Design goal:
This protein has two helices and no strands. By secondary structure, it is an all-alpha fold. This is Serine/threonine-protein phosphatase PGAM5, mitochondrial. It comes from Homo sapiens. It is found in: Mitochondrion outer membrane; Mitochondrion inner membrane.
């Protein structure tokens, strides 16, 4: 779980204030592939 751990550490370190905004905009924001 080396990739599952690093991806999780950066998640809680980069998914709090920007997450609430991503969902607030996704209300109408089209899905252009993603990542």
């Amino acid at each position: 779980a080396f990739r599952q751990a690093l991806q999780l550490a950066a998640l809680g370190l980069a998914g709090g204030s920007a997450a609430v905004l991503f969902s607030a905009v996704a209300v109408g924001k089209p899905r252009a592939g993603g990542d």
